[PDB]
A paper describes a structure:
While the S, M, and E proteins mainly contribute to the outer shell structure of the virus particle, the N protein forms the viral capsid by packaging the viral RNA genome into a helical ribonucleoprotein (RNP) complex. The [name]-[name]-2 N protein consists of 419 amino acids and comprises two structural domains: the N-terminal domain (N-[name]; residues 49–174) and the C-terminal domain (N-CTD; residues 247–364). These two domains are connected by a highly flexible linker region (residues 175–246), and at either end of these domains are intrinsically disordered regions, namely the N-arm (at the N-terminus; residues 1–48) and the C-tail (at the C-terminus; residues 365–419). While the N protein interacts with RNA through the N-[name], the N-CTD is involved in the self-dimerization of full-length N protein and RNA binding.
Numbering used by the authors: 39 to 173
């Protein structure tokens, strides 16, 4: 009758991931890399990508890494919500559109996948990507 339910996951990226197909980490030149979000202000255009690598058990019973995925989070949100903009950390890269305000984006926050689908991550036409990334 009463089907169990856990605490909600409220911490997902609003956007789909950028999959790393090659050997190069994600990186963006200064001023590039913030995904398109038409429901945001110029003040809002700042955050980080965080690498996540999924592992699966192969046929041999041994663990294999899949292609790394890089997920975008607005500044002050997500798994590294505490970090100030530009805090270097392995697996983190920082991006900001010129004019963004260096303040946490609590008014955007993160996504509950049970309630909202991810937005396809789109970048402005002309954005530079490293080899191994496509958008």
């Amino acid at each position: 009758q009463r089907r169990p339910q856990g605490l909600p996951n409220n911490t997902a990226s609003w956007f789909t991931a950028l999959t790393q197909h090659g050997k190069e980490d994600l990186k963006f030149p200064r001023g590039q890399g913030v995904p398109i979000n038409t429901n945001s202000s110029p003040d809002d255009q700042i955050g980080y990508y965080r690498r996540a690598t999924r592992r699966i058990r192969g046929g041999d019973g041994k663990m294999k890494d899949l292609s790394p995925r890089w997920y975008f989070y607005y500044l002050g949100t997500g798994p590294e919500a505490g970090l100030p903009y530009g805090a270097n950390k392995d697996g983190i890269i920082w991006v900001a559109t010129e004019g963004a305000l260096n303040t946490p984006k609590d008014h955007i926050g993160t996504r509950n996948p049970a309630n909202n689908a991810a937005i396809v991550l789109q970048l402005p036409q002309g954005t530079t990507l490293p080899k191994g990334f496509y958008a």
